[PDB]
Amino acid sequence: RERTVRLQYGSRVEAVYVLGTYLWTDVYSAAPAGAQTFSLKHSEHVWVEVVRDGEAEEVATNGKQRWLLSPSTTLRVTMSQASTEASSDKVTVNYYDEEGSIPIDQAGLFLTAIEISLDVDADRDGVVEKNNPKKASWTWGPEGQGAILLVNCDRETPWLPKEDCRDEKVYSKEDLKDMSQMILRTKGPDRLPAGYEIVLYISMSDSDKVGVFYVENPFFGQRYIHILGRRKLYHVVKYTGGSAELLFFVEGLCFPDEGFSGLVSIHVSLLEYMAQDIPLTPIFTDTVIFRIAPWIMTPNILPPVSVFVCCMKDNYLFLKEVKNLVEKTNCELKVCFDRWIQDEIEFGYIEAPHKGFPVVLDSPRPVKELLGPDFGYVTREPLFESVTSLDSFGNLEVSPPVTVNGKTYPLGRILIGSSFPLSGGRRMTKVVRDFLKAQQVQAPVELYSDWLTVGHVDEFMSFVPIPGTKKFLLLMASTSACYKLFREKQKDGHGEAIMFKGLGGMSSKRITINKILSNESLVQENLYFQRCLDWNRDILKKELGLTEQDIIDLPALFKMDEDHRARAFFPNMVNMIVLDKDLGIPKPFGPQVEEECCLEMHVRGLLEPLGLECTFIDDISAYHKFLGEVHCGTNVRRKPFTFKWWHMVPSRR
Amino acid sequence: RERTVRLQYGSRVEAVYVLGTYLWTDVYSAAPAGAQTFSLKHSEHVWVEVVRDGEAEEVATNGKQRWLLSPSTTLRVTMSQASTEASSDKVTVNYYDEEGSIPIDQAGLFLTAIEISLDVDADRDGVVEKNNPKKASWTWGPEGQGAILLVNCDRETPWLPKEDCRDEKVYSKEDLKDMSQMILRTKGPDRLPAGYEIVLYISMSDSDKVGVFYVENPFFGQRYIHILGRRKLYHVVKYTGGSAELLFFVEGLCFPDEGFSGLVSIHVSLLEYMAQDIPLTPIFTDTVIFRIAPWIMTPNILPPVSVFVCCMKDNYLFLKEVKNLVEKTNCELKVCFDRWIQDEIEFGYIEAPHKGFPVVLDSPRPVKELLGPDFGYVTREPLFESVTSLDSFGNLEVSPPVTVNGKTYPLGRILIGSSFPLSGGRRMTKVVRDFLKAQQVQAPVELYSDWLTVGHVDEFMSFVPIPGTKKFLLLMASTSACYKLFREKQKDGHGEAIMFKGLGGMSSKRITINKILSNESLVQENLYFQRCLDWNRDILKKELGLTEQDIIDLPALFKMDEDHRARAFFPNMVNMIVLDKDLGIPKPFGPQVEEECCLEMHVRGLLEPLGLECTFIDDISAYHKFLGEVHCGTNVRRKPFTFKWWHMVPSRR
């Protein structure tokens, strides 16, 4: 970077020189009227070239050389090392007229060289490198560069309710581990020359996106000073001489969203005082950029850590069977004593090179009670738009990693249920949809859920890993599979086999295979629901790059309501607890053939040959009947993807 | 694209098949309970494969072949040509049990094949190609693809005041020339089968970005129907059989801006009627994308077309000299009988493959009086923020094409004046800055203008082409050049030479070179203003990739006000009319030496050796004095760049 510093007619000029720049210096304006030629002297650590109309010539410290004065003959002045107290760094120009070789006048330039660099870990190894030349840009991908910031959304200490980033203070040194390091490195003499100061600053716009803290160690112990952030746009830095570093810690306050890309900047400037009432001049400016890490969802193929479960204290069979299932794994079981754990919360995560942790997304209105150390919280509230069932997180899921027409989605794709564009039907609120879209790395896809009364994608589809492989299956609810099976069992002489055996509140209904198959209107309803399922099958195959070989159909059956929307006739088996090879599957209570549920046997016949182990989990017996509603919920918290999100190259927005 | 169509237990299935897709067909669900095997027949134009667990086998129209029934054995059904009235397109499946070779049941699929494609000129040659496979995406660059739309911001007929795009109507067929063509191409039999319709639609969000018209030729002459746009989100298409095309014309309503990227979509869907009260199902959907062309500014290196001039009717010298200047060129002179033509308007342009024209940007509050056929209008109004002098378009300029550290800016870079970040000074309103940024192709740079009372970049800098070359110069105001020259003339014995000769209202002041050079406070002020100029010089060199060889300094002098801001002491010569090699330069009224202005002679000495021809234009004599204000204005409307904006690859936002 070239910077203009002119000699001044009369008075000598004193300037600060920042390493990594160089000066172009006008010696002509300072020359007396009528002067002919000039000569120069300079000190040891100042490098000086005379540039005549673009041609540069190096000049000795004391020579006698003279050059013709001319507006096109200038100096280029460079310094490679910072000044110390032992420095006299200078360039002196002598002027001569046509008569005589004794100078008629002299113009000086006195320099103080300093190093100033604002440094971040741009190369994303967790350590802060010295002046990464790419630190002011942010690029995606394996070869990409620029520093990353976490939203510091967890809570270090229980005493205050809110997440850490909601204020301007740091209570605990543990909080600093969530933060990105930024070091202002300087080198120079004991003090800056008169009239200069160093200032860190941010834009008003970014002031609600970041906060920046400096650690002091005064007498009575460590304290944390907020130097940039909400209602603080600048901080005047205390300069220390010699080779010095100031360590700062940066937190993100806000996730990427509609209208916020995730990029924020921090600057340092060397400012020069001109006079009272006159703004200070920015002599040198150095900039670093951060990208705030997105919120990321975990598909069922990822290793389970904890199984969160909600039910009533007396649903014993459910608790017993879920415990049994989880005991086959290394997972923790966590129980809260009615669908809220699945509908109100989605467990995501955030990651930066230095740190990562899980973050709960809270569905629009006690889930804030999960907020804790390295367990974060984020939520979106529609300001205007009304919330519907499609805003519940049973309607929010994510695919395994997929490749679609050569385009890779290494983190998978978020899936949310919706209605047809011209339908006037329900849709997840714009505020949540915009949030998910803005995270960018999961490239969300809308499916069609609005044919269901509750309207959730988890009612009709799920994903399971195929054991012993890198692959997965899409599981789809299928009414056609159910009718085929029931018609077979009828043909086999089982038409009088009864559903819901053991649920005493259903006994008077005496629902058999015969009764189901004879119900003409129910047949028509389910043919229509199969059309709805197949529409989704097609969009899933398209948007996930799946073929028929990747799909298994589980028997399902629905009843239609007044809105022509579906609710489960018997428990939906597709919405299952997936812990690697072990599947908790809702117990269907299907027709008993030879004292086994034919639905259970059919499902085992589909899954078991693939190495999947099926456990049927009864959540309804405690209620004595099934009306289409599930009274329990589960949510599995999983390990994050191995693939780092910053290695993705998302499509241009 | 694969689509799911199942045979139905009992009743035959009738379906529409859209060319370019294919069907995967379940024959198992339709099979009677206990059936063992199936066989199939199909018609001539239906291609059928039996797919067993992923392995596909082509099947003849009438064979006798049987396959084992199985959920994993399915049909793949393809058609290469649309149905006509002579078509019976079908596939029929026969089912068999273990005993006997006579079918026990049959399930049919009756097909009607149609072609549906919504086509646009994606390859950007001005003609609408058939189904460009990239039509649903928009990519930048020489190899880029996707269709382009103009904001139709001009006005075809004078009767209504507003720009064409402000309503839902088209009065004149000339308007269609500004619009992009979109053709819905179909092929099929006399009518769609019962229960289907074709519908064009857009999102609510895009409904204020576009409008779409169809031309009818009824008995009494041509009429224009608005089928999509404001408050119309969909249009049901009238289907014509055989091979048919419907031609539509698309206009943009809105420029890219903060919160609008410029991309809009239009869809067509084939919809299936399910029943009353049930949404129609989107059987097939085809999509095209448009990008709305940005507003682009023209630098001084571009060929002049028209010179717009505003002054009082009696400023005769100004009018005479401007006419003389323009007569040396092929330009039109347009005169309006006080700075408004430069401050209130910036002449830009828009371009699409089919059409382009000039578009005026109107500065925030009779410039709307320029609105006319192929002369467009756009403006931005701050809703809240107050307008200052920095919002005037003397503060809005653009560089010639430049390359900066290997990054090319083939359209140049917009330049707007501002204040230092921490200064609390003036800045152009966010609404205009956001607009300029959103055009993206000119990558705006803020300079420092707030040291000037009026605060406009055109007070201190301009660009001129270097005749006979592909190159250009940056011209900078320089106080140091002025002091050097005046000190030389003083030394030469000219100190008593007077400024402002011939301006009678200044005579009593008797301003000479001596009086100027002796004024100590004025010297200090101008040293400070030179610091301000040099700060800009540095940012221009950095952001435009310029060296000292690319810059010429014109003598200038300023007086300071109470805010420590500069106003011109004598007319600013840098703000000049550039018509190729011919430069109208404000007449400075400098000290006369040998009956010529020494400022004029000095400027000629700088410019003339480069082949630039200088004409000094006197706009102040009619006012008898110069107070720092200019009473005339000029604005040159130029030809657009040869380089097409869509060939640029702007940085990711």
Ligand SMILES: [Ca+2]
């Ligand atoms: Ca590093």
Ligand SMILES: [Ca+2]
């Ligand atoms: Ca805090």
Ligand SMILES: [Ca+2]
């Ligand atoms: Ca924390």
Ligand SMILES: [Ca+2]
């Ligand atoms: Ca923490």
Ligand SMILES: [Ca+2]
């Ligand atoms: Ca969920």
Ligand SMILES: [Ca+2]
């Ligand atoms: Ca074309």
Ligand SMILES: [Ca+2]
């Ligand atoms: Ca119109």
Ligand SMILES: [Ca+2]
């Ligand atoms: Ca028009």
Ligand SMILES: [Ca+2]
């Ligand atoms: Ca027109």
Ligand SMILES: [Ca+2]
């Ligand atoms: Ca302008």
